[PDB]
């Protein structure tokens, strides 16, 4: 039930986490270039 809504939420995060990792990476490449 609302449990299903918690599963969903978690997914929604785990997604963003991955996204951001990659972005942090990008930024490291950036910080390096300076």
């Amino acid at each position: 039930g609302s449990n299903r809504r918690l599963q969903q939420t978690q997914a929604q995060v785990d997604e963003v986490v991955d996204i951001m990792r990659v972005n942090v990476d990008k930024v490291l490449e950036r910080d390096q270039k300076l």
């Binding site: 978690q10 995060v13 785990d14 963003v16 986490v17 951001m20 942090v24 930024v27 490291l28």
Partner: protein, 62 residues
């Protein structure tokens, strides 16, 4: 059992969720921390450029 367990498992699952947020947040902080710092370096290349411009520009006009 099913009374208390249904809880305990919901509870567990929440910790999973928190730790995910924790990480996420952590990433968001560091992110800012870096772009803050990088901004600074950059405005120094603004200083270095703005100068090099004034110099070469002024060293041509006759």
């Amino acid at each position: 059992g099913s009374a208390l367990s249904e809880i305990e498992t919901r509870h567990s699952e929440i910790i999973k969720l928190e730790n995910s947020i924790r990480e996420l947040h952590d990433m968001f902080m560091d992110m800012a921390m870096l772009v803050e710092s990088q901004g600074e370096m950059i405005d120094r290349i603004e200083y270095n450029v703005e100068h090099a411009v004034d110099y070469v520009e002024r060293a041509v006009s006759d």
